[model samples]
Target: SKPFTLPILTLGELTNSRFPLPIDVLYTNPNESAIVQCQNGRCTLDGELQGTTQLLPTGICAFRGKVTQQVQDEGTHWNMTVTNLNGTPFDPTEDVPAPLGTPDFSGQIYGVISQRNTLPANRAHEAVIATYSPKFTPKLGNIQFSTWETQDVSSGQPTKFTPVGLASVDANSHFDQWTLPSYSGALTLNMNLAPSVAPVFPGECLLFFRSFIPLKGGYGNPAIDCLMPQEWVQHLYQESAPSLSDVALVRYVNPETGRTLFEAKLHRNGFLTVARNSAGPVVAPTNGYFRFDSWVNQFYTLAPM
Candidate 1:
């Protein structure tokens, strides 16, 4: 994994919707030869490919109709479709996860943005950012998995990404489903948020985040509280180390409308308290307390709408 790097992706520059986004690819064989290249959304290698493929813009890498003699050739061939490519870069701090075989691990990191409805100017578009640090197994040689996927409803690009917790990992070669421990949220929340006007909540908008961590010889349950204001998202995005008192977390969506209004996590004895920037002078509002009704476990401000 040394000498390897994640392909740098520049959103402003990737102005063309015709090609795939860019990503770095590395493949090497200490015994034979090696290949390390970068694919700016155009990656393919096939005489016959099952997935999507584009050209010029592309080419092939195969090993067929051959006979092994005193010579040896090893490594994987490329030429396949790259799906779910979006977002440029927001998290400019965290280090890229090392490739497999290294002691380090990589997982998914999520972001939920609830901006106060800025009216006919902003609309009901909600923004969420998800960074995937997929734990690369020994199998994904020279090929990259989905890394940074995002959608800003207000930003204009429409395919809102609501990763409602987890998706299939490998659909091609193997079929073993193993959840990665410390890799961000690993699960794809794939949910959506609209401006319900906070008619029942306190803030102009609510932002939350949830991360899966390591536990009892395995990854245990993530805390129900990682909630915070959208301001903290910058600190998190910058890879800054802020105390939990500053973070609160996650959201629950309505099944029918496919959208969520208020956002909150559990607090004390079956009761619900809104999040606070308890981490310092950057506190939330003074009279901000939400009540979680036991009748249905839904969140609402202490007062009525």
Candidate 2:
């Protein structure tokens, strides 16, 4: 299999400001192309976007990309990591139709690649696809619990107030979650794989393991919430700048023994660089698992570790 290089780049101010420009990673192969993006380091994967002029929290922007074809499961998967330094001064505000105060963006795009096939392939083993979604719920308690309450007083309609995910006393309730605090002990996600299925496209198939805490809010800060930890929230938003360490994490696990195989974090540019097969070619396990608290919207195949 040919090595696929992943280079993540981010420009402008990195913050949860009014209008922080979104960062993204675009991948392409023979069968299909995919785009993963997020304002913070965490992101969701879907379609690709190219040749667009957008606005960052600081100013305007421009971008372009190139990608190779996808890799098959048993087709010589190779993996590696690379870092390149770039110091080009690119100012978006200087554009003909741009605004003012856009600082010079001198940034670097970090690169990583994955590979497999250090040894001869086994005809007995096979390739497969496994997908997982984050599970979220409020902890049960005698008095303290989680719920959504309307905080508005304008009073529009005098109707029902049936809020969603209302946690009653002594009863656990559902909540929106994709990534969670590390100590939640709920990162173990269940996945079912069909051995006959494998990643067909270069970047299109095979789910990339990832996580990120949703910055959107309603109330009940994690810092004060008893169910999750304050440090986890603090770490997720550390330095007010997005980094791989600042977001939630997704762990790939062994289904049989429930042991963790690997963990993945998102880049600031909303891309996940997976060093798949870095250890060597692996036989596809009968069962596999991907665990995380963040919502996983893409379908991916699990390569045995």
Candidate 3:
């Protein structure tokens, strides 16, 4: 596959902000193209205010990228990461965007590519168009739980309560997910190829094996709630930043019993996800489940070790 490189914009203040990637590697295969942005499906591949402007409307920004890495699954999907200079700077009055201070400096890093293949040509898989996703272990309780009440809310309105809701919990409620471990390697991940479906674009189809997470900047405290522990989503949005790569695919293989336990597609972004649970979110109902209070906590920790 041919590599594509391009530049958007940059700031000195956001070097340590919430980048969707690990910062061990430097710029390679570079291109100095303008930023691409899209709103309500109307997209601009190049910036309207190329040289004169310094900011952007908080939209889904795009950048030219290259193949960073690959994973072995069905033997396809150029599963790698890309870099873009779509970051914002810090502000002092924005106490809510604390730690890094507000106005904040932040941007997005993603494991996405405009791949050519959608569905599995061989069999046993399907290509679906989605921007949001969820997964849980047994501890996350059963899938039969009601997400209506927790997800739906209404405030007092004209002779009635207005309907408005917010997420009070981590939407990505996977138990045993303690803090992200301190890894010596890059935050790079691999994609899963279903054998038939393979990425077909040059630098456009960085076949994604990760998730596309919904970022947040709600409540007040920033960085503390960010995906990479930095600033808030609102500030990042104000900076016209791109979102992180919250999507990744992981497959399970069993050796002894010759059984595959489960296959999960994961996503990570720079905000906390909130979900509404009418009957309380799907979490651990027993002692050894995969929720917040599971007695076992982590059952698969040893398997990875």
Candidate 4:
């Protein structure tokens, strides 16, 4: 409504043990029929995630388990295989209709670089969020969902993030199938014909974002801390905010990828759009977790990044 009254959230600094990227990735937004929450206490449903709902589950929006691998991407980003994961998609953004607690609400999820074709000189990438727009006829929405997940014909990691669907939220945590993909043209389109509101087809519009997890970052401890790596990710999302109804997002993948680059688990900040200026209170970026520079900047530069 009135531009969510919550105060701008700040990024925190690395102080805890360096965390690594997940190993086994899994998700299912197949029909783009679901919504996801950035941080449980954060916001409600917004359709940026389902962009690729018709394609792949980006990965575990999050995972719960013990860390075994500690590989780093670029900069300080690190990734490792996850030992165990609880397949429960948390949608706290808008409102989900599968009742407050029902298995009917779950769906596969995934992530891919939207800039698979971007030339190195002209760098670019987009992060997408999606779910079946209208559940019914999703083929024709404001932003139409693809009939299927786009292939990783270009560059970037996670060419494809295969999702392991959950049977039950708590007990039957066993994955037995590969989620299917959804698209717009195939989905039945249903929308409101309000006077002013832009009508949304079932699978047309989607939430789109550009991933910017710096590749040169690393955890402070480099042994257990993922400060720099995590920041690389959050810095990107924390600064990204795009709106879409259908989840029409894309990805980039490397062909015959060179062995020069190692595949480390990458840490992307959850999709929490509401970009903050890199020039606010020192505590602004990280909620004061590492605001010493903000305080120090008062005597020198006008701001901090």
Question: Clashes in each model (backbone N, CA, C under 3 Å)?
Answer: 27, 18, 41, 92
Give the per-residue lDDT of model 3 (tens digit) for 1-305: 21111122121112222223211211111121312111111111121111101232222222222223332333222221222223232222222111111111112111222322124221111111111112101011100111112212111110111111112224342111112211111232211100111112122211111112233223321121112111122233334423223232333333344443333222222111111112211221111101111111111121210
Candidate 2 regions with alpha-carbon error over 4 angstroms: 1-234, 239-259, 263-265, 270-305
Among all candidates shown, the one with the greatest lDDT:
2
Poorest 10 consecutive residues of model 4 by lDDT? 290-299
In candidate 3, position 11 carries an lDDT of 17
For candidate 4, write residues 1-305 as lDDT tens digits: 21111112222222111112321111112133323322111111221221211111122232221112222222111121221123233332323221111111122222322222223432222222223223211122111112122332232221222222221222222111121112222353312110111113232221112121212122211111111223323333343433222121111112234111111111122221111122211111112221111111111212111
Order candidates by lDDT, high to low.
Answer: 2, 1, 4, 3
Off by over 4 Å in 3: 1-54, 58-63, 68-70, 85-112, 115-305
Model 2 per-residue lDDT tens digits across residues 7-55 = 2112111222111222111111223232211111222122111111122
Prediction 4 TM-score vs. true: 0.18
Candidate lDDT (C-alpha), each: 0.21, 0.22, 0.19, 0.21
lDDT of 3: 0.19
Per-prediction TM-score: 0.18, 0.19, 0.17, 0.18
